[PDB]
Amino acid sequence: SQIQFTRHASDVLLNLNRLRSRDILTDVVIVVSREQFRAHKTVLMACSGLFYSIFTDQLKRNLSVINLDPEINPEGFNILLDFMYTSRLNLREGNIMAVMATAMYLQMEHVVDTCRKFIKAS
Amino acid sequence: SQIQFTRHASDVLLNLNRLRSRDILTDVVIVVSREQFRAHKTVLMACSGLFYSIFTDQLKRNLSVINLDPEINPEGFNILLDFMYTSRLNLREGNIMAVMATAMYLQMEHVVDTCRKFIKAS
Known part of the structure; x- marks a missing residue:
């Protein structure tokens, strides 16, 4: 079988986030109430x-x-966008409900599941 | 610290490869002698x-x-493009030199290092 590079996917994601941080090849703006967030459509779709x-x-x-949707909070959206680009989810007592509802809206089912686990463990 | 999703990066890469396989949001053609390969610039850059x-x-x-460069072989390039999108490198006795030289040209230093290890172990 082929040789497996165990850090490659994480390396790619890091580099895609670096591209976002420099606004390189971003191709969409996501408007969330009074804020705007640029991103790569491919990462959003993924x-x-x-x-x-x-x-x-x-x-x-x-x-x-x-x-x-105008009901979506920028903070909750930003937390999820960062997750998309990092694999790290900033879930806290003060943000869990907003993050969970936003993840439902964005149809991010693994994150929704994790929010439910956070509630259960909390 | 934030919650870490250990499969997220690999999931994202899988989905980016699925996008490539469907020619969704590909934005460049890489011409390699008589063949052409479509890709996402962001993944190439990453x-x-x-x-x-x-x-x-x-x-x-x-x-x-x-x-x-006209000296680059499509097979070797394709092997590396697949690697970029999968984390899996199809290195074999029959292709190692072409893959290694192509990886040098593409400035993929971890892959070059791995090719040298393949030679050493072979």
């Missing part, structure tokens, strides 16, 4: 059922601006 | 010093076609 369902549709694939 | 140095330069960032 992480979220909502963004997958949007951009896989040829009708919507070339959108450069996505306005989220 | 994996290869050559592609990083090209696309981080505003002069070249919007190129949609990259012609590699």
Whole structure:
């Protein structure tokens, strides 16, 4: 079988986050109430059922601006965007409900499951 | 500290490869002698010093076609492109030299190191 590089995927994700931090090849702005977040559509699609369902549709694939539901909180969204790019989820007592509801909206089922576990353990 | 999702990076890479397989949001063609390979610039940049140095330069960032050195073999390139998207390197006795030289050209130093180890162990 092929040789497996056990750190490669994490290295790639780190580098994609570095690209985001430098606004290199970002191709969408996500508008969340009064804030805006630039990202790579491919990373969004790789992480979220909502963004997958949007951009896989040829009708919507070339959108450069996505306005989220006005009920979504920027903090909760930012926590999830960071998760997408890092594998690290900043879940706390003060943010869990907002993060969980935002993850439901973004169709991030593993994160939703983890939020439920956080509630159970809390 | 934040909660760590140990499979997330690998999941993201899998999904990016699925996007490539469906030609979704690919934004460059890499021409390698008589063959062509579509890819995502962000993944190329995240994996290869050559592609990083090209696309981080505003002069070249919007190129949609990259012609590699005519000496580069498509098989060797394809093996490395697959590696970029999978973390799995198809190294064999029959391809090691071509893969190693191609990895040198693409400035993929960890892969070059691994090729040298393959030679040493062989």
